Amino acid sequence: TSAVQQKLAALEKSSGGRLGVALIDTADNTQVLYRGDERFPMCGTSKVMAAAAVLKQSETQKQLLNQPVEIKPADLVNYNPIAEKHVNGTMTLAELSAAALQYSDNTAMNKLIAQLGGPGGVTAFARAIGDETFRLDRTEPTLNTAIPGDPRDTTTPRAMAQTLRQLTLGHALGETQRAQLVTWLKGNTTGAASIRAGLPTSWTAGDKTGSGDYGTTNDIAVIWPQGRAPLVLVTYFTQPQQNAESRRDVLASAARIIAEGL
Numbered sequence: 001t002s003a004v005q006q007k008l009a010a011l012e013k014s015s016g017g018r019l020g021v022a023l024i025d026t027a028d029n030t031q032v033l034y035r036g037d038e039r040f041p042m043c044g045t046s047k048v049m050a051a052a053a054v055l056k057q058s059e060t061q062k063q064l065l066n067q068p069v070e071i072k073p074a075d076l077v078n079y080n081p082i083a084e085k086h087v088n089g090t091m092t093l094a095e096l097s098a099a100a101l102q103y104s105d106n107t108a109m110n111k112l113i114a115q116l117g118g119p120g121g122v123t124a125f126a127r128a129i130g131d132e133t134f135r136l137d138r139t140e141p142t143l144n145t146a147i148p149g150d151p152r153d154t155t156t157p158r159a160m161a162q163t164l165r166q167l168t169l170g171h172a173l174g175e176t177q178r179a180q181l182v183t184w185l186k187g188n189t190t191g192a193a194s195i196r197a198g199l200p201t202s203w204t205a206g207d208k209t210g211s212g213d214y215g216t217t218n219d220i221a222v223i224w225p226q227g228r229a230p231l232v233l234v235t236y237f238t239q240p241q242q243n244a245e246s247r248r249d250v251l252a253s254a255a256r257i258i259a260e261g262l
């Protein structure tokens with residue numbers, strides 16, 4: 001138990017919920033874990049794996065990202081800020097990837113999942129890049145039920161941090177695809193209250209948030225601290241009551257503890 005792990009435990013104790021953290025510091029490859037091997041519901045953070053899998057497919061199909069996908073009225077689900085504008089029209093796979101990542105559009109995520117052959121296709125890509133933990137079992141919006149003890153649509157902080165590192169800083173994707181993914185993450189619109197609220201302003205980052213039932217509040221990020229090699233940070237948080245409120249502040253607090261511990 002490290003000093004940082006002790007502060008994370010204190011934060012968790014005061015939060016009432018269950019906190020999972022995984023940091024990889026690429027300056028030396030060291031890691032900091034808190035419940036790093038416990039499973040948590042991914043919710044929207046799973047959108048990174050789906051977009052990355054489509055990017056992988058695009059490496060052998062130069063026109064894939066320009067394929068027009070039909071958006072029908074019935075395709076709309078619970079949260080579709082971008083897709084709703086294109087009902088009875090089409091969106092390209094690039095448009096669907098950007099909407100899923102940067103706006104957390106659920107209809108867009110469902111189109112990425114369908115392009116991959118269903119939730120199992122997203123899981124297959126994860127296995128192909130060495131992630132033996134990740135599992136996607138359902139489409140949107142049910143993949144966000146986040147029921148405690150339910151293994152569906154979960155991963156561990158350790159696994160997600162390693163995967164995010166390989167996707168954004170490593171060679172799991174071709175260079176062009178890696179750059180596209182990083183560009184999309186850096187352009188996220190939903191993350192200012194989460195991990196990034198706990199980092200010094202000078203630091204830059206890309207992230208993908210997630211939210212679900214049980215007050216599930218998640219964020220995964222790739223960070224470029226001022227004058228330091230990048231970090232990869234995963235912060236997952238879930239609560240005992242189905243109707244619990246979101247706690248993005250708890251993710252900010254975890255990130256702050258990690259940053260001050262550097």
Ligand SMILES: CC1(C)S[C@@H]2[C@H](NC(=O)Cc3ccccc3)C(=O)N2[C@H]1C(=O)O
Pocket residue numbers: 043044045078079103104106141144190208209210211212213
């Ligand atoms: C924008 C959101 C807050 S909502 C969207 C998706 N989750 C859901 O659609 C399900 C949900 C269930 C209960 C409470 C919030 C969201 C998901 O995850 N999303 C969040 C995000 O990207 O941070």
Ligand SMILES: CC1(C)S[C@@H]2[C@H](NC(=O)Cc3ccccc3)C(=O)N2[C@H]1C(=O)O
Pocket residue numbers: 067068069070
């Ligand atoms: C149903 C589809 C697979 S077809 C349309 C678009 N597909 C293409 O651009 C090439 C293609 C044509 C026929 C069958 C598969 C792929 C694309 O992607 N679309 C999918 C959709 O609308 O849901």
Ligand SMILES: CC1(C)S[C@@H]2[C@H](NC(=O)Cc3ccccc3)C(=O)N2[C@H]1C(=O)O
Pocket residue numbers: 166167169170171172
């Ligand atoms: C492409 C890779 C297989 S290589 C990189 C990392 N593996 C290593 O860094 C192995 C290594 C050990 C010591 C010195 C240099 C490289 C790791 O895992 N990475 C994968 C990735 O980037 O997606």
Ligand SMILES: CC1(C)S[C@@H]2[C@H](NC(=O)Cc3ccccc3)C(=O)N2[C@H]1C(=O)O
Pocket residue numbers: 026027165166169170171228229230
């Ligand atoms: C110091 C570096 C040359 S290495 C560090 C990071 N690169 C990686 O994390 C590559 C990698 C990906 C997956 C697994 C292992 C290594 C990255 O980018 N970093 C460079 C930097 O900050 O200048």
